[model samples]
Target chain A: ETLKQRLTNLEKKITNVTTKFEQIEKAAKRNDEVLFRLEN
Target chain B: DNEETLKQRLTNLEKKITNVTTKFEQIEKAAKRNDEVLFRLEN
Candidate 1:
């Protein structure tokens, strides 16, 4: 089991990671947009 | 403007971007690795 791929565990990890990534991307995009507006 | 000040700010931004990039890379690599493992398990 240790070496075998566990779909459930992998999916859960991927979901968590994806969510965190989206959160970071949203924050970064918001910051960039604000900075652009300020610059303009 | 002092070259040193500009360089310092640039370095700081570079570090910030590097950190973000590393996080992105880790997420991407993990996703890919997980997918491959899943494929192997399915086959």
Candidate 2:
């Protein structure tokens, strides 16, 4: 029961982590668009 | 046990979230360049 409660507690933080991860993805996506024109 | 305590906890959580926010910037900058890497991996 305690372990289950611990997992429940972490749920909010996991959501926050997921949100931050996605934010990074978008920022990276924007960066790519600008540099896409680069060539060898 | 009251509003002030609750507010303080929220402030602490904000700080923690902000730490995560700070982390996103660095990865995001790398992610900024992630496209080129996706174009082709290198030695």
Candidate 3:
């Protein structure tokens, strides 16, 4: 009963990391758009 | 610089809060189960 589901937890971590990475990528793209507008 | 910095930080904080809240729910569920297990085992 003591946190025996290691695989599930690892999967959860991986899923969250992937999701966060995607969010960061999207944010970076938006940042580039802002930069472009500022430059023009 | 100011807008860029603020936007980046806001994005980071937004994601951080979302991730933390997701984990917090899981932890709360786990805590509830643990308490139930302990109670059943003791009884």
Candidate 4:
């Protein structure tokens, strides 16, 4: 039971980091797109 | 300055990714037969 609980915690952390990565990617892409538009 | 800051942060993403992978490594190594955790990390 203890092990299962810990495993659940780890899974939660993975989802957190993964979601953070997506957020960063989205922000970067948004900025990049606008910069390109300005240049053109 | 604006572009430069973004470029630096984009590079920092690699470091963050590395940290997350390392965490998963520890979790996987510590898991027992009953410990089964799975999920997707994609946007």
lDDT of 4 by residue, A1-40 (tens): 4545655655665575578678989999999999999999
Over the stretch A1-40, how does candidate 3's per-residue lDDT look in tens digits? 1333543555565576568678989999999999999999
lDDT of 4 by residue, B1-43 (tens): 1444544655655565565677667777777422433323221
Against the hidden true structure, what lDDT does model 1 obtain? 0.67
Instruction: Tell me each candidate's TM-score.
Output: 0.43, 0.41, 0.38, 0.40
lDDT (Cα atoms) of all candidates against the true structure: 0.67, 0.65, 0.71, 0.64
**Docking quality class, candidate 1:** incorrect
Q: Residue A30 deviation, candidate 1, in Å?
A: 35
Candidate RMSDs in order = 14.1, 20.3, 11.6, 12.9
Could you list the iRMS of every candidate? 12.5, 8.4, 7.5, 6.9
lDDT for each residue of candidate 2 in B1-43, tens digit (9 for 90 to 100): 2445544656766776565556666777888688678767762
Candidate 3: misplaced stretches above 4 Å?
A1-40, B1-5
Q: TM-score of chain A, model 2?
A: 0.69
DockQ values per model: 0.02, 0.03, 0.04, 0.04
Write the number of the candidate with greater lDDT, choosing between 2 and 4: 2
lDDT of 3 at B32: 95
lDDT of 3 at B35: 97
Task: Give the candidates in order of TM-score, highest first.
Answer: 1, 2, 4, 3
Superposition TM-score, candidate 4 onto the true structure: 0.40
